[PDB]
Structure formats: C-alpha cells, structure tokens
C-alpha cells in the first residue's frame with residue numbers, strides 16, 4: 001500500500017489506534033476542520049447572516065463568486081437560493097475536495113464549482129462572466145487578521161463589474177480599554193510572601209496582540225469592566241476602500257467614563273450589510289458560544305511608559321487619555337501605546 | 348541583538364520597550380504563557396511550601412529538577428536549607444532564576460546549573476541530596492516525562508534516605524457529556540443542507556488540551572457519566588514507566604445514561620496529607636491553575652465505521668475501554684471495546 005507523507009497516522013504512536021477514515025487523510029486538513037470549521041458551521045447567527053444578505057441579492061440570473069470556500073457552506077447557500085452559477089475558490093487542496101464532496105452529497109454539483117487556487121491567481125478566463133455577487137468570509141479574530149481587505153481589493157480591481165454587490169459591505173474594528181483582575185492574575189506577579197518576584201515583570205508582553213481563546217479565556221465567562229466608549233480604530237467599505245485608507249499610524253483621544261486599571265486593550269469588531277450585523281463584541285456573543293470559540297476577542301496588555309518595569313495604565317473617570325495606534329504594513333497587526341506626558345511620536 | 352531577539356519578530360512600526368527589545372523570544376513566550384500563571388497558582392505554591400517545611404532542616408541539601416523561575420528553590424532556601432542546587436535546561440531561564448535569587452539575597456544558598464538533569468553528575472553536587480524537588484507535570488501528568496527524569500536522577504544521584512517531592516501521582520479519566528464541546532467538535536448540517544460528510548474528519552485520536560478548544564471546563568456545563576477511571580498511579584520513589592502496562596482495560600459502569608462525547612483527563616498529586624488536583628471540581632476558584640494546566644480531552648468514537656459513532660451510555664450497564672500508552676507513556680488513548688481493539 002501507500003501512505004501520503006502528510007497522513008494522520010504518521011503523527012501518531014504505533015501503539016495508538018486510528019480509524020480508517022482518518023489514517024491516510026492529510027494532517028493539515030484534519031487540523032483545519034477540527035480546529036475551525038466545526039465551530040464556524042455551528043455559528044448559526046453567522047450562517048443566518050450570510051443567508052439573509054444573499055436572500056436579497058440572488059436571482060435565477062445571479063452569478064456568484066466566493067473567496068475562500070472551505071467547506072462550501074456559503075456557496076451552497078447561494079445555489080440554494082436558486083443562483084444561475086456559483087464559482088467557489090479555495091487555496092488549499094484538501095479543503096477543495098471536501099467542498100466538492102459536500103456539493104455532491106447535496107443537490108448542487110451542477111450549480112456550484114470549486115477551483116483549487118488562491119483568489120490572487122483567479123483570472124477572468126476562469127469565470128463564465130463577471131459575477132453579480134462576491135461572497136467572502138475571511139475574517140479572523142482581528143478583522144483584517146487574514147487579509148480580507150487585500151484579497152477583495154485584488155479581485156475587485158480585476159474580476160468584478162460596476163453593478164457587482166459585495167458581501168459583506170461594511171466592517172469596523174473596535175478597541176476598548178478594560179479592567180480585568182482575572183486576566184491580571186495570568187499576566188502579572190509581584191511576589192510570594194517575603195520573596196520578591198517583581199523582576200519577572202521585566203518580561204511582560206505589552207506588545208503582542210493575543211487571542212483570548214488560545215490562552216484559555218472567554219471574555220463572556222470572565223468579569224471585566226469597560227473603562228471607556230468603544231474606539232473606532234477604522235471603518236472599511238469593501239467596495240471602495242483600500243488598505244492605505246487605514247493610515248499606518250493614528251491617534252485616538254479617549255475619555256475615561258470609569259476609573260480603574262486598564263490592564264489591557266480589548267479588541268472586537270462588527271461587520272454590517274444593510275440592517276444585518278456580525279458582532280465579535282462579547283455583549284452580542286453571550287449566547288453565541290460557537291462564535292467565541294471561532295473568533296472570540298483579542299487582547300493587548302498596556303504599559304504606560306518605557307520604564308525598566310511595566311507601568312500600569314490607570315484611568316481616572318472624566319480625565320482624558322491619549323493613544324498611538326501603530327499598524328503593520330499589511331494592516332494585519334496593530335498596537336495601542338499610551339502617550340506619555342519616547343516610544344510614541346504623539347503631539 | 349541576538350538572532351532570537353524579541354524585536355526581530357515585530358513590525359518596524361510597532362514600539363517595543365527597552366526591557367524587551369534584546370530579550371530572547373522563547374524566554375518571553377515561556378514566562379508570559381506559563382510562569383506568571385504558575386506563580387499565581389497559590390494552592391500549588393502552598394502545596395510545595397507545606398511539604399517542604401515538613402522535611403527541610405538546616406542540615407538538608409535540596410536538589411530541584413527544572414528550576415525555571417526558581418520559586419520552589421527560594422522556598423527551600425527560605426525554610427533554611429543548607430544547600431540548594433536547582434537544575435534548569437533553558438539557558439535564559441537559568442539566568443532569570445539567578446536574578447530572582449540575588450533579589451532575595453539568597454545568592455549563596457541556591458545554585459543554578461544550566462543543564463538537563465540527564466547530564467547532572469555527582470560531581471556537580473556537594474553531596475547526595477536529602478530532598479528531591481520537582482514540578483514537571485503537564486496538563487497530562489506524565490506529559491512532560493516527569494517520571495522518567497526523576498527515575499534517572501533517582502538511579503544515579505540520590506541516596507537511600509532521599510525524600511522525593513512529590514510522592515504520589517494518579518492520572519484519572521472520566522467519560523463526560525458536554526453539549527458545548529459537541530457543538531465545537533461536530534456538525535450535522537444547516538437546514539436542508541447536509542454536512543454530515545464533514546464528520547468523516549472528526550479527530551477521535553488526539554488528546555487536546557481544554558484551553559486549546561478555548562474551553563475552561565468550570566465555565567462550561569457538563570455531566571460525568573461514571574466514577575473516575577484511575578488510568579494509573581505512580582510512586583516517584585520506586586515506580587518505573589515499565590510499571591505502567593502499555594495496554595490496560597477498564598470495567599466502566601455507567602452511573603448515568605447519556606452521550607459520552609469525550610473522555611475528560613485530570614490528575615491528582617499526593618504527599619502525606621497534601622493534594623494537588625487538576626479535577627475541575629477543585630479548580631473552581633483556582634483560575635490560574637486552569638490556565639497553566641486545565642484539563643485534557645479526547646473525543647470518543649464507538650467503532651470503526653466510515654463515520655464517527657457516538658458512545659452512548661445507559662445507566663447501570665458496563666462499558667469496557669482499552670487504554671493504549673505510547674512507549675514513553677507520555678501519550679495515551681481511550682477506545683471503547685465492542686461486544687482496532689484487543690478485547
């Protein structure tokens with residue numbers, strides 16, 4: 001017999017039993033589905049979001065194009081609503097097949113087609129015509145975390161026609177300074193009785209954006225306080241915006257509603273199309289448990305200045321606080337640095 | 348600027364404090380991901396403090412495997428040990444420990460060696476130690492080979508009278524029903540759309556840490572379908588990994604009827620009267636422990652069909668499970684025995 005180099009069994013001790021359905025299946029595909037896709041599909045509210053927005057844009061003469069088909073659920077929705085043709089693009093090989101198999105298992109093998117490629121190499125030749133609708137779910141815990149704006153923009157410039165409706169329409173990344181003792185106990189140490197340990201603080205990570213779930217935390221489960229109104233880091237119109245519409249450095253003047261300790265900046269985002277909303281805000285994901293597991297929220301520990309040891313950002317209600325937001329080149333990573341009163345070039 | 352410097356993996360536009368710029372990334376990741384949480388697990392710290400002060404004389408020489416930050420050695424020194432030698436494999440962690448030791452003026456009580464305990468020879472020690480101190484437990488108790496590393500030191504460096512801390516370790520397992528976990532790990536479909544083919548890929552083999560699902564078991568609602576399954580127990584002063592059979596079987600009687608979505612894995616460490624538990628029923632107020640360890644999970648498939656079959660419990664009936672250990676006993680797997688298995 002033969003075993004693919006990336007077969008699941010290869011990752012597993014000889015003494016441990018593996019079901020035939022898993023043995024020769026590629027590790028990455030298994031990891032992809034088990035870690036993300038199962039949680040995505042049980043995000044009913046997410047599925048309901050895309051079904052409703054498609055429902056008001058799909059005619060039997062509607063040509064649909066989806067970026068990142070994965071399992072093909074969204075592409076199935078387009079066809080389910082009676083679309084003329086659906087072409088779904090998927091970057092990895094094994095996800096491409098899995099989509100097709102889901103497409104045969106259901107009705108739509110004639111209606112929906114899945115191309116193995118990145119949307120970057122998708123050419124007008126690969127499409128029947130310019131699509132009426134562009135479909136996309138390529139949002140991460142950070143909205144542009146998996147470069148959603150860049151992939152749509154490339155496709156928007158090359159493959160779409162004027163009348164093309166882009167789903168979804170709007171996207172906004174928010175930031176909130178929060179007090180959260182529970183998080184603080186995971187990320188800070190002073191000492192144990194007589195023993196001084198504050199030197200450990202030399203190493204505290206004030207720079208990295210961190211996904212709540214990866215370190216075992218769900219903000220809906222943890223008690224915390226929002227020390228201010230949401231901060232609109234940036235808005236994006238997917239049918240007109242570019243990644244340079246997001247200035248690589250911005251300054252935000254935040255008014256503290258409540259006094260407390262800003263242990264961390266909490267990062268969430270909302271996606272809008274007409275009256276329909278996709279929210280990453282923990283207030284809206286209380287009952288959407290699968291969403292907190294797929295997207296969740298992101299955190300960044302705040303340091304007030306550049307001392308040898310981190311300085312706590314203490315908010316005093318009514319008093320005003322100034323933050324410098326620095327994006328990376330691809331606008332995929334960002335950072336919130338409190339302005340002093342010389343890491344920042346605040347003025 | 349070291350090749351492993353923290354700045355070097357950060358965008359040029361993002362600001363990095365001087366205390367972090369030239370610091371090795373691995374050190375930062377380690378301290379931030381684990382050490383902070385360890386140090387705020389005060390039950391854990393209190394566990395070792397109480398077991399230590401029961402054995403530490405001003406005549407007691409202490410040897411710690413895996414110093415890391417070296418807090419436990421600071422405890423042994425604080426309790427007035429005559430000499431403490433703490434061994435640490437990470438070069439950057441070893442220096443971090445030394446600094447903590449200077450900050451508490453115990454520079455001459457505690458010595459930190461940059462090596463693996465495998466390389467620790469009697470030459471490196473003043474005397475065969477009176478006390479052996481270890482914290483090398485993972486979310487899976489033997490997940491970090493805590494048993495093997497102690498056995499090597501036990502065979503080569505210790506003396507008959509050497510008290511090993513901690514004494515006992517028990518790896519438990521419980522079959523549980525958990526609707527929240529099920530929604531994260533399975534899919535049937537969406538309305539008329541059938542997505543059951545997705546189930547072909549459901550990972551039934553891998554042991555996944557609960558926090559890597561993003562889950563803390565104390566926050567999520569679940570049912571235990573039977574009494575705890577003692578997979579194995581180890582005496583760190585006499586057991587070898589060969590004492591753990593490569594394959595064990597278990598008569599598991601269902602206390603309750605339900606769906607065994609998964610096998611929950613926790614453990615308990617014992618020394619005299621003192622207990623270190625990973626059971627989520629004991630970590631309800633120990634939020635740092637659930638973050639540094641938490642629990643483990645394995646999804647259960649009942650047989651070997653083209654699709655996963657739910658393991659369903661009927662109260663009062665028996666369910667035989669086969670447990671297979673990897674060679675180093677670091678990894679294990681629970682498989683239901685049908686009326687892949689040797690049963």
Ligand SMILES: Nc1ncnc2c1ncn2[C@@H]1O[C@H](CSCC[C@H](N)C(=O)O)[C@@H](O)[C@H]1O
Nearest residue numbers: 068069070073074089090091118119137151
């Ligand atoms: N430029 C790109 N081109 C094609 N596929 C992409 C892509 N970027 C990400 N992807 C793929 O899109 C998927 C993101 S999630 C899958 C969404 C799917 N339509 C659903 O709702 O079920 C991943 O599988 C990823 O491999």
Ligand SMILES: Nc1ncnc2c1ncn2[C@@H]1O[C@H](CSCC[C@H](N)C(=O)O)[C@@H](O)[C@H]1O
Nearest residue numbers: 413414415416417418435436463464482496
């Ligand atoms: N055989 C081994 N020998 C020496 N150090 C080890 C080791 N196995 C693991 N370690 C190290 O021990 C540490 C495990 S965690 C440190 C726990 C420490 N007692 C404290 O509470 O601060 C890690 O730094 C690891 O690199």
